[PDB]
Amino acid sequence: GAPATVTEQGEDITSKKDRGVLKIVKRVGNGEETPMIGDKVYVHYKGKLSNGKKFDSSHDRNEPFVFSLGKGQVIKAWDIGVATMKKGEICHLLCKPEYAYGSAGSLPKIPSNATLFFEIELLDFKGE
Ligand code: NA
Numbered sequence: 001g002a003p004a005t006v007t008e009q010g011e012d013i014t015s016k017k018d019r020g021v022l023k024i025v026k027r028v029g030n031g032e033e034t035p036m037i038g039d040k041v042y043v044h045y046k047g048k049l050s051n052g053k054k055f056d057s058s059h060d061r062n063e064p065f066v067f068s069l070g071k072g073q074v075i076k077a078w079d080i081g082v083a084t085m086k087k088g089e090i091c092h093l094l095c096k097p098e099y100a101y102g103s104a105g106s107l108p109k110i111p112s113n114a115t116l117f118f119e120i121e122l123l124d125f126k127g128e
């Protein structure tokens with residue numbers, strides 16, 4: 001399925017080249033511009049654990065998730081991954097725990113040392 005495919009066929013987008021964040025572009029976005037550090041970014045996403053369970057979805061809440069890029073307001077894999085996306089793009093990210101919630105995990109559903117899969121859509125980005 002999709003998590004196996006990004007694990008085996010994804011692009012390492014880390015600056016360390018440590019396979020910690022793998023990406024596949026699923027829907028090509030618009031133009032060539034990617035967001036800037038500090039921009040307000042608006043995303044839709046769904047997250048799955050390596051056991052197949054869905055742990056989160058913004059679609060199910062009928063509102064996007066909004067954060068300031070490159071500020072550590074989200075897991076490192078998202079600050080790195082969303083910074084590579086074009087407006088309108090949909091991608092898959094496969095995130096090792098060192099770029100996600102590490103040994104602590106995140107209650108109630110993310111265990112310690114969890115590799116996470118996300119589908120992310122970059123809806124928009126704007127500077128303040
Ligand atoms: Na595929």
Ligand code: NA
Nearest residue numbers: 084085086089
């Ligand atoms: Na891109």
